[PDB]
Write a protein that binds this ligand. Structure first.
Ligand SMILES: CC1=C(/C=C/C(C)=C/C=C/C(C)=C/CO)C(C)(C)CCC1
Length: 141
């Protein structure tokens, strides 16, 4: 993948989500939670100023907020997901935002990037990859 810009500001609505089940299973998220969440449309709100990100992922079941500064390791406590601690580091690789979440689970992280007018997110854990695509709702520019 390749990002067309580093500016990820805006509100984005999920248009596809593939193998979210596999990803959730790899995180040991319980059956009942998986069944509720698997096909609920998510919305992502990204507030970005340079390297400083504030993000919200919302649905009619659960939300998940994570804020970070690119380059700076932080303690991500994954409440409402698997309730673990990971040492999260988000970096740019070209115009792809790459997160590695170091902790118990192997190969845990995500990659997020813009192509033209859509936002793409790939979530990984263990041997599972989930691919998501979000259409634009709002951008500042
Ligand atoms: C598993 C699971 C969820 C996971 C959301 C995730 C994994 C969000 C990741 C956000 C990161 C990648 C921010 C940058 O986009 C939500 C809360 C939807 C519903 C409850 C079950």
């Amino acid at each position: 993948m390749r990002g067309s810009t580093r500016d990820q500001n805006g509100t984005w609505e999920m248009e596809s989500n593939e193998n979210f089940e596999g990803y959730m299973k790899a995180l040991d998220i319980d059956f009942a939670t998986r069944k509720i969440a698997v096909r609920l449309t998510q919305t992502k709100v990204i507030d970005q100023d340079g390297d400083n990100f504030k993000t919200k992922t919302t649905s009619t079941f659960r939300n998940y907020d994570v804020d970070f500064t690119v380059g700076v390791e932080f303690d991500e406590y994954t409440k409402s997901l698997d309730n673990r601690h990971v040492k999260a580091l988000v970096t740019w690789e070209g115009d792809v935002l790459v997160c590695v979440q170091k902790g118990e689970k192997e190969n845990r992280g995500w990659k997020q990037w813009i192509e033209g007018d859509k936002l793409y997110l790939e979530l990984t854990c263990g041997d599972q990859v989930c691919r998501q695509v979000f259409k634009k709702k709002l951008v500042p520019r």
